Design an enzyme around this catalytic site. Structure first.
Site, PDB file in Angstrom:
ATOM      1  N   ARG A 103      -4.923  -4.024   1.302  1.00 51.99           N
ATOM      2  CA  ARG A 103      -6.204  -3.329   1.107  1.00 51.99           C
ATOM      3  C   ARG A 103      -6.707  -3.305  -0.306  1.00 51.99           C
ATOM      4  O   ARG A 103      -5.933  -3.271  -1.219  1.00 51.99           O
ATOM      5  CB  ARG A 103      -6.160  -1.905   1.649  1.00 51.99           C
ATOM      6  CG  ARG A 103      -5.853  -1.853   3.108  1.00 51.99           C
ATOM      7  CD  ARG A 103      -6.646  -0.783   3.797  1.00 51.99           C
ATOM      8  NE  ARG A 103      -6.311  -0.781   5.208  1.00 51.99           N
ATOM      9  CZ  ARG A 103      -5.389   0.017   5.751  1.00 51.99           C
ATOM     10  NH1 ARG A 103      -4.719   0.895   5.005  1.00 51.99           N
ATOM     11  NH2 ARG A 103      -5.142  -0.053   7.047  1.00 51.99           N
ATOM     12  N   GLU A 146       0.834  -1.198   0.000  1.00 49.85           N
ATOM     13  CA  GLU A 146       0.000   0.000   0.000  1.00 49.85           C
ATOM     14  C   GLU A 146       0.875   1.257   0.000  1.00 49.85           C
ATOM     15  O   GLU A 146       1.647   1.492   0.934  1.00 49.85           O
ATOM     16  CB  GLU A 146      -0.992  -0.014   1.177  1.00 49.85           C
ATOM     17  CG  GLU A 146      -1.915   1.189   1.215  1.00 49.85           C
ATOM     18  CD  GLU A 146      -2.825   1.173   2.433  1.00 49.85           C
ATOM     19  OE1 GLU A 146      -4.073   1.062   2.259  1.00 49.85           O
ATOM     20  OE2 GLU A 146      -2.283   1.257   3.562  1.00 49.85           O
TER      21      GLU A 146
HETATM   22  N1  ADP Z   1       1.205 -10.027  15.721  1.00 52.13           N
HETATM   23  C1  ADP Z   1       1.839  -8.963  15.984  1.00 52.13           C
HETATM   24  N2  ADP Z   1       2.317  -8.777  17.217  1.00 52.13           N
HETATM   25  C2  ADP Z   1       3.052  -7.601  17.640  1.00 52.13           C
HETATM   26  N3  ADP Z   1       3.234  -6.613  16.579  1.00 52.13           N
HETATM   27  C3  ADP Z   1       2.754  -6.790  15.338  1.00 52.13           C
HETATM   28  C4  ADP Z   1       2.062  -7.904  14.957  1.00 52.13           C
HETATM   29  N4  ADP Z   1       1.735  -7.711  13.656  1.00 52.13           N
HETATM   30  C5  ADP Z   1       2.263  -6.494  13.302  1.00 52.13           C
HETATM   31  N5  ADP Z   1       2.889  -5.927  14.367  1.00 52.13           N
HETATM   32  C6  ADP Z   1       3.576  -4.638  14.493  1.00 52.13           C
HETATM   33  O1  ADP Z   1       2.613  -3.573  14.741  1.00 52.13           O
HETATM   34  C7  ADP Z   1       2.899  -2.469  13.875  1.00 52.13           C
HETATM   35  C8  ADP Z   1       1.876  -2.353  12.736  1.00 52.13           C
HETATM   36  O2  ADP Z   1       2.061  -3.407  11.781  1.00 52.13           O
HETATM   37  P1  ADP Z   1       1.939  -3.200  10.206  1.00 52.13           P
HETATM   38  O3  ADP Z   1       2.194  -4.519   9.470  1.00 52.13           O
HETATM   39  O4  ADP Z   1       2.784  -2.023   9.786  1.00 52.13           O
HETATM   40  O5  ADP Z   1       0.352  -2.858  10.233  1.00 52.13           O
HETATM   41  P2  ADP Z   1      -0.636  -2.513   8.995  1.00 52.13           P
HETATM   42  O6  ADP Z   1       0.265  -2.581   7.797  1.00 52.13           O
HETATM   43  O7  ADP Z   1      -1.747  -3.549   9.028  1.00 52.13           O
HETATM   44  O8  ADP Z   1      -1.137  -1.145   9.399  1.00 52.13           O
HETATM   45  C9  ADP Z   1       4.296  -2.757  13.326  1.00 52.13           C
HETATM   46  O9  ADP Z   1       5.258  -2.329  14.264  1.00 52.13           O
HETATM   47  C10 ADP Z   1       4.324  -4.273  13.218  1.00 52.13           C
HETATM   48  O10 ADP Z   1       5.632  -4.809  13.096  1.00 52.13           O
HETATM   49  N1  CL9 Z   2      -8.191   4.855   1.825  1.00 55.73           N
HETATM   50  C1  CL9 Z   2      -7.624   5.450   2.888  1.00 55.73           C
HETATM   51  N2  CL9 Z   2      -8.197   6.506   3.485  1.00 55.73           N
HETATM   52  C2  CL9 Z   2      -7.609   7.074   4.565  1.00 55.73           C
HETATM   53 CL1  CL9 Z   2      -8.368   8.488   5.320  1.00 55.73          CL
HETATM   54  N3  CL9 Z   2      -6.457   6.650   5.080  1.00 55.73           N
HETATM   55  C3  CL9 Z   2      -5.873   5.602   4.501  1.00 55.73           C
HETATM   56  C4  CL9 Z   2      -6.443   4.982   3.401  1.00 55.73           C
HETATM   57  N4  CL9 Z   2      -5.654   3.976   3.039  1.00 55.73           N
HETATM   58  C5  CL9 Z   2      -4.614   3.974   3.902  1.00 55.73           C
HETATM   59  N5  CL9 Z   2      -4.766   4.959   4.797  1.00 55.73           N
HETATM   60  C6  CL9 Z   2      -3.825   5.317   5.867  1.00 55.73           C
HETATM   61  C7  CL9 Z   2      -4.211   4.859   7.246  1.00 55.73           C
HETATM   62  C8  CL9 Z   2      -2.851   4.712   7.886  1.00 55.73           C
HETATM   63  O1  CL9 Z   2      -2.511   5.991   8.424  1.00 55.73           O
HETATM   64  C9  CL9 Z   2      -1.886   4.417   6.753  1.00 55.73           C
HETATM   65  C10 CL9 Z   2      -1.464   2.975   6.635  1.00 55.73           C
HETATM   66  O2  CL9 Z   2      -2.384   2.410   5.713  1.00 55.73           O
HETATM   67  O3  CL9 Z   2      -2.592   4.679   5.564  1.00 55.73           O
END
Ligand code: ADP
Ligand code: CL9
Ligand code: ADP
Ligand code: CL9
Lengths: 228, 242
Positions: free
Chosen positions: B110, B35
């Site tokens: 996503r 993403e």
């Molecule tokens: N199962 C888990 N346990 C502890 N931390 C996790 C886990 N999965 C992801 N994280 C950590 O939490 C934070 C958010 O993860 P991330 O993969 O960047 O989330 P997303 O991409 O779904 O927003 C990162 O620091 C990630 O390494």
């Molecule tokens: N469609 C989306 N609309 C909004 Cl308001 N925010 C988004 C979107 N897609 C990702 N993010 C943002 C949320 C997190 O801050 C970051 C990681 O995905 O990206």
């Protein structure tokens, strides 16, 4: 894609819709893609983004430009895929183009400081993408610019009386006027579209009335067309 | 179209990226479409064939930051772009990758469906977009996935379930500055939208094939190490049903 592709240009209110609906009648074989400005006034009773834009353009300009560009691509597109389809020697007249949008209107609003550093950038990313895709079908075969001096358009804006327009200053209309010259008259504006530069351009004057010069213009086309 | 397409859904920080980037290393036939959040905290369109020789690609606006610190004003400007850059990205990986692969699988951080039915529509719902902005936006979005028809039709969905509290925490771990302001109520509003789409299936979109799309729901609440095996095993399983 046998459908030849010509976009009528020139400024706000030069005489586009007029000239082209006129030229449309010259053949049972020629059609017209007008600006869907219809939609813009009542977005779907929806709101008026064109009105909105003019009033506070620092807020609404980007929102308009992308929506304007959208609706155009979309009708231009819709009109390639029917009507004319299967006809003696098809021809399609565009009230403006995706290229007028970016490099005339959009670009100008960026200078005007109404679209910021980021919006201007998002828009062009947006506009490029859309025209590395769909606009590889709306490739211009010619441009027919219709010149008319700032003060004529300012007054033609009253002849039309589009409520969302009697506020438009001369100052505005001259900027718009400079971008058309540059791009179209002199050709002193090489874009980021390689194909544009050699594409034929036929200028016509439209400052005088449809009195004693107008019907004549038609001919400046009938021949000009099949010169390729 | 021989390539299968699987989106990874779930609230900010639930841990999609982390999870699924680990899950791609299992098989050579699997590839992942990140993403573009990078390109939202640093906005930059393409450079001129010559300009780029004497001029860098410099730092420009961080629209993500803008959409968060004054939503009322920046959300349509974030939706429009967050959606653009996503489709562009997913679209290129459809046509550039996994040619020499037997059973290929492309994962999405996503969907374009979650942009519109979670963030955008939530942002519409807490009036950060006006009727006008919301109409425009769904006009543009409808048209685009009309102009591709089946090219990006998802073949399955992996919902990664975390709690808002967890997520808030995982937000603090990761540490993107533009998220340190995010309150709990936000991820909640967003969590319920995900539960409507992907649990209860009560949400009415505009693409019917969505209702019938298989949906694997995985609990990601517990710290990574424990449930990994089970998740990996539930995934390969789910996958050999498509
Ligand atoms: N199962 C888990 N346990 C502890 N931390 C996790 C886990 N999965 C992801 N994280 C950590 O939490 C934070 C958010 O993860 P991330 O993969 O960047 O989330 P997303 O991409 O779904 O927003 C990162 O620091 C990630 O390494
Ligand atoms: N469609 C989306 N609309 C909004 Cl308001 N925010 C988004 C979107 N897609 C990702 N993010 C943002 C949320 C997190 O801050 C970051 C990681 O995905 O990206
Ligand atoms: N050649 C012309 N001479 C005098 N009035 C014109 C001429 N062409 C158009 N008009 C009038 O000026 C207005 C704008 O014409 P229109 O074709 O709608 O302009 P555009 O489509 O370029 O904005 C209308 O009120 C129309 O009556
Ligand atoms: N890309 C565009 N950007 C702007 Cl600011 N306005 C446009 C555009 N395309 C058509 N119009 C509108 C402006 C005039 O009011 C009307 C005249 O045809 O069309």
């Amino acid at each position: 894609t046998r459908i030849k592709k010509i976009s009528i240009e020139g400024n706000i209110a030069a005489g586009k819709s007029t000239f082209v609906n006129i030229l449309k009648q010259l053949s049972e074989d020629w059609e017209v893609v007008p600006e869907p400005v219809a939609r813009w006034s009542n977005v779907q009773n929806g709101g008026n983004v064109l009105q909105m834009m003019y009033e506070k353009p620092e807020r609404w300009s980007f929102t308009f430009q992308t929506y304007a560009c959208l609706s155009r691509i979309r009708a231009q597109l819709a009109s390639l895929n029917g009507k004319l389809k299967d006809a003696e020697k098809p021809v399609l007249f565009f009230e403006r183009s995706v290229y007028s949008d970016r490099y005339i209107f959009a670009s100008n609003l960026y200078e005007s400081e109404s679209m910021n550093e980021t919006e201007w950038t998002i828009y062009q990313d947006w506009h490029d993408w859309m025209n590395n895709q769909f606009g590889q079908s709306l490739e211009l075969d010619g441009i027919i610019y219709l010149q008319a001096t700032p003060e004529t358009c300012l007054h033609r804006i009253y002849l039309r009386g589009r409520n969302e327009e009697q506020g438009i200053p001369l100052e505005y209309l001259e900027k718009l006027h400079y971008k058309h010259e540059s791009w179209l008259l002199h050709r002193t504006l090489k874009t980021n579209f390689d194909y544009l530069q050699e594409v034929p351009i036929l200028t016509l004057d439209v400052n005088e009335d449809f009195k004693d010069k107008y019907a004549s213009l038609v001919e400046k086309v009938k021949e000009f067309l099949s010169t390729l």
